[PDB]
Amino acid sequence: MYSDVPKFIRDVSIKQHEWMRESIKLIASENITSLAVREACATDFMGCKYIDEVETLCIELSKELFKAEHANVQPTSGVVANLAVFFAETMALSVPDGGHISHWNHPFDPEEMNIDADAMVKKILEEKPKLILFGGSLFPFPHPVADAYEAAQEVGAKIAYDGAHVLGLIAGKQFQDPLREGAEYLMGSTHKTFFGPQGGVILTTKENADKIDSHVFPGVVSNHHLHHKAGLAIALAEMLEFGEAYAKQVIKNAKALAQALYERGFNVLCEHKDFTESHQVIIDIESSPDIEFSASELAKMYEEANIILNKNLLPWDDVNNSDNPSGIRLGTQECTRLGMKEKEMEEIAEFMKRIAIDKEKPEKVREDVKEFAKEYSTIHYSFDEGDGFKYLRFY
Amino acid sequence: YSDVPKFIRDVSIKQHEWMRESIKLIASENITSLAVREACATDFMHQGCKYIDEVETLCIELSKELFKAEHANVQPTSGVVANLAVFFAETKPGDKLMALSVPDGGHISHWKVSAAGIRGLKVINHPFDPEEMNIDADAMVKKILEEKPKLILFGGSLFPFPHPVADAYEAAQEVGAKIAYDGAHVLGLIAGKQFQDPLREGAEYLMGSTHKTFFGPQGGVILTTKENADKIDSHVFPGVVSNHHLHHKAGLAIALAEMLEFGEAYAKQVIKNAKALAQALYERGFNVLCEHKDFTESHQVIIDIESSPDIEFSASELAKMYEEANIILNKNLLPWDDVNNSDNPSGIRLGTQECTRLGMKEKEMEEIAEFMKRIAIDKEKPEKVREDVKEFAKEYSTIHYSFDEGDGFKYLRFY
Numbered sequence A: 001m002y003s004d005v006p007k008f009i010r011d012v013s014i015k016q017h018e019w020m021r022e023s024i025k026l027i028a029s030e031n032i033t034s035l036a037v038r039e040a041c042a043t044d045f046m047g048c049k050y051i052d053e054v055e056t057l058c059i060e061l062s063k064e065l066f067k068a069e070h071a072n073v074q075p076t077s078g079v080v081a082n083l084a085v086f087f088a089e090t091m092a093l094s095v096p097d098g099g100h101i102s103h104w105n106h107p108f109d110p111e112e113m114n115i116d117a118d119a120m121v122k123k124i125l126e127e128k129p130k131l132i133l134f135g136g137s138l139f140p141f142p143h144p145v146a147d148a149y150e151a152a153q154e155v156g157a158k159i160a161y162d163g164a165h166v167l168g169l170i171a172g173k174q175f176q177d178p179l180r181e182g183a184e185y186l187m188g189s190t191h192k193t194f195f196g197p198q199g200g201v202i203l204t205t206k207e208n209a210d211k212i213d214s215h216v217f218p219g220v221v222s223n224h225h226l227h228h229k230a231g232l233a234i235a236l237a238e239m240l241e242f243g244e245a246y247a248k249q250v251i252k253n254a255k256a257l258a259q260a261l262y263e264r265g266f267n268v269l270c271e272h273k274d275f276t277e278s279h280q281v282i283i284d285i286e287s288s289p290d291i292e293f294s295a296s297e298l299a300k301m302y303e304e305a306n307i308i309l310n311k312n313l314l315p316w317d318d319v320n321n322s323d324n325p326s327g328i329r330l331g332t333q334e335c336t337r338l339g340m341k342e343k344e345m346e347e348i349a350e351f352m353k354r355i356a357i358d359k360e361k362p363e364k365v366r367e368d369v370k371e372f373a374k375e376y377s378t379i380h381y382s383f384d385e386g387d388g389f390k391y392l393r394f395y
Numbered sequence B: 001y002s003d004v005p006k007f008i009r010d011v012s013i014k015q016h017e018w019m020r021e022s023i024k025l026i027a028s029e030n031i032t033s034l035a036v037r038e039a040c041a042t043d044f045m046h047q048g049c050k051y052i053d054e055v056e057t058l059c060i061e062l063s064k065e066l067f068k069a070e071h072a073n074v075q076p077t078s079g080v081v082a083n084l085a086v087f088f089a090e091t092k093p094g095d096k097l098m099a100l101s102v103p104d105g106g107h108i109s110h111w112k113v114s115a116a117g118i119r120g121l122k123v124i125n126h127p128f129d130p131e132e133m134n135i136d137a138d139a140m141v142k143k144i145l146e147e148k149p150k151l152i153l154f155g156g157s158l159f160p161f162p163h164p165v166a167d168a169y170e171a172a173q174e175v176g177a178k179i180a181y182d183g184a185h186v187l188g189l190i191a192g193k194q195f196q197d198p199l200r201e202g203a204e205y206l207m208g209s210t211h212k213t214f215f216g217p218q219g220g221v222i223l224t225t226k227e228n229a230d231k232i233d234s235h236v237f238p239g240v241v242s243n244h245h246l247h248h249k250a251g252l253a254i255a256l257a258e259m260l261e262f263g264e265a266y267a268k269q270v271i272k273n274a275k276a277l278a279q280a281l282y283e284r285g286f287n288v289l290c291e292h293k294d295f296t297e298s299h300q301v302i303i304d305i306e307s308s309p310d311i312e313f314s315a316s317e318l319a320k321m322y323e324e325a326n327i328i329l330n331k332n333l334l335p336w337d338d339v340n341n342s343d344n345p346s347g348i349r350l351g352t353q354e355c356t357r358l359g360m361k362e363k364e365m366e367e368i369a370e371f372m373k374r375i376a377i378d379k380e381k382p383e384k385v386r387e388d389v390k391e392f393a394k395e396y397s398t399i400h401y402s403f404d405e406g407d408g409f410k411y412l413r414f415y
Helices: A004-021 A035-040 A049-066 A078-087 A121-125 A167-171 A227-241 A243-263 A295-304 A333-337 A342-356 A362-374 B004-020 B034-041 B051-067 B079-090 B137-147 B165-175 B187-191 B226-235 B248-282 B315-324 B353-357 B362-376 B382-394
Strands: A070-072 A131-133 A158-162 A185-187 A202-204 A280-284 A310-312 A327-331 B071-073 B097-099 B123-125 B151-154 B178-182 B205-209 B220-224 B300-304 B330-332 B347-351
Touching: A004 B034, A004 B051, A004 B248, A035 A227, A035 B004, A049 A070, A049 A167, A049 A227, A049 B004, A078 A158, A078 A185, A078 A202, A167 A243, A227 A243, A227 B004, A243 A280, A243 A327, A243 A333, A243 A342, A295 A310, A295 A327, A295 A342, A295 A362, A333 A342, A342 A362, B034 B248, B051 B071, B051 B187, B051 B220, B051 B248, B071 B226, B079 B151, B079 B178, B079 B205, B079 B220, B079 B226, B097 B137, B137 B165, B151 B165, B165 B178, B187 B205, B187 B248, B220 B226, B248 B300, B248 B347, B248 B353, B248 B362, B315 B330, B315 B347, B315 B362, B315 B382, B353 B362, B362 B382
Parallel strands: A131 A158, A158 A185, B097 B123, B097 B151, B151 B178, B178 B205
Antiparallel strands: A070 A202, A185 A202, A280 A327, A310 A327, B071 B220, B205 B220, B300 B347, B330 B347
16 A cells, blocks of 8 residues: 555656646746756755855845845745735735735726826825835736835835746846835745745845844744755856846747737737737737637647646736636746747747637647757756756655 | 855755764654655646646545545645634634643744734633643633633644643533644654544644654645535635645655555654653753653653753753754743743753654664763763764664655755
8 A cells, every 4th residue: 555656656747847848838927947956955954054054145145136235035935025025014906907816906007008107106195005016917017116206205105016927037137126216125936037946035125124034934943945045045146147148038038929929810918019028928819809719718728739828817807706717828938948039939929829720739739849849958047057857866 | 156056065965964964853853755855856836737736636635544534735835824724714803712822832823923913813822731741621621611712722832742632622612612733743643643633532623734743845734624625725825826836745745655654653653762762861860841741742852951950051052062962952942931032941842753764763762862961961072972973873864664765865966
């Protein structure tokens, strides 16, 4: 009994490794991590001098990359990284407007995928908030951060930035620089556009210094990652050396992919505003007359063709219980890491056209997709250009 | 930054080798088998994947068998978050929670400074019997009736004897209270059927951490009844929809298998070692708590340093001294410690779970006590004993109670 369980999960995970290798991965929420960072996460770090040094190095590297007077690296995810700053001084996008569920909104025009640059300013004064948050799951264009800190401080309101999806772009100096554009707080997840391990990070100034470190639930003996800290250290160093060139290609690949889709007859949002400035490509399947498939149908069809993406709630949808949403969300951050360029995005968009418009069997397109994906199983923008999806046996 | 990857590579290899040559007695930590560590090492960055649901449903099913529970939830990223979910599910803001107090050995989570400070503000303490190391069961029943809490919580950070779960039941059922058991520290022994059986003693919920006595990866598990299944699933936040975290779930499933096959044997030895180590320390001049009750019924050994006449060192000093001697343990506040706000606690807490995983038996416990006595009572220099200590630890580096007779502290290079 129970002898075959280790073997069963060893075999399944290998199959998972192989499947992901021969797939185009386009989930905006998922990146790929280098063998060096992955090596540090296998050292579970379970009387602790060597943990004190990695702690300080993470803080030392976080201050240099994001340019902050203070940096905390102790939260286990972007969610609690928010909660820690939420507990400090005790609103952002509606879920539908910008995702990101918390319950323990900004003036937004659906046509222009951004917070209203004029209507928000008049909203700051005549609503009297204490915490202004710029952050969302559906984040195509940079938020008016500098158009907010001329009204916040006069009414006595502080400014935070949940760039969980965008953290990696800010590090490579590409999307925006909120911390010098007004934002006093910068939260974020370390595993999305930032190609690090699962973990949360907080960045702030000591201008008043609310000292979050006291109330993030600090356990140095009770319940924390530690093995993810060693990977965080390496990830930072990678983003410090390669982040510039990485975030440049990410934002370009997104654009290239977005236009490639549009030209093939995908109603991807804001063609006049050039689709996005971030890693995301947001497409309206509902108002795509040529398609004829549901966004739910499409995501399930693409998965059969080895194209992984997720259906999304576009602001204009049904009452927030949606088995059948209107949108499909794409992210170029992982594909950029495997070494796909602007010309490679066109090939991807063609695979997507064949399924959605040409109505070609997804099992047939699968063959071309896995042949294309195999050719990009090497981790770029790192010190160790090795085999990603490599399976390392321990016994 | 180019030599940062090489830097932490050395720091982590040194960490491994230092840990190999140390006696690890921190009750909050344990050692993982190579299989479990391999499964985590897959480190997959996670709606697309099908193999993810397969290992997670197997976790749920394995947990149900191991703990004999009608429903299981393996989404929690820690025991603390597991408690949060139950608090969320069973308490509206500003409700009475009955828990074992922090000074009396409860967990930070349970109180106004932590998880309970986020949802259900009003926390009342279990009556505690400091001469024993347990809840005053007789007074407890009375308090249930008088104060009328909605959630009664058993379990603690300082947990040497099983809690009176069954004594609470009838009083709780009258008051309209539910009863939960934070198995964080003791989950492994419960899975090995050794400490107590809360689910068959009146607990509707059994929360836990999967890394403590339970030699799985980091994360938390909630075990409950079919009644509460829908209620619980809804309230645990970091699961299927956001932050998958399905790499430690792969390793959980293996740990579940290991606990099913070796759990009984393992847990039996843990208590036996804890008892032997306590007895070996007592005979040697260490005032280890509750000699009349045979010291422990769990993995822990609590020793009162301040009221150890022979020692002469501070509880705080000894912790730092043992660190220089490669004996890693933690100093702890005792129920009679003047203020909770004390940098200088009176006691030292020990756990035998990892030493048991590494293949140590009662004989080895006596040797560990002998090393400890040399520092504490003989006043032998930490560096002198350290060398004899690191020779003793070197031969206990193989992982027992697994399917792989492999070497823990083994370092795998990925590139």
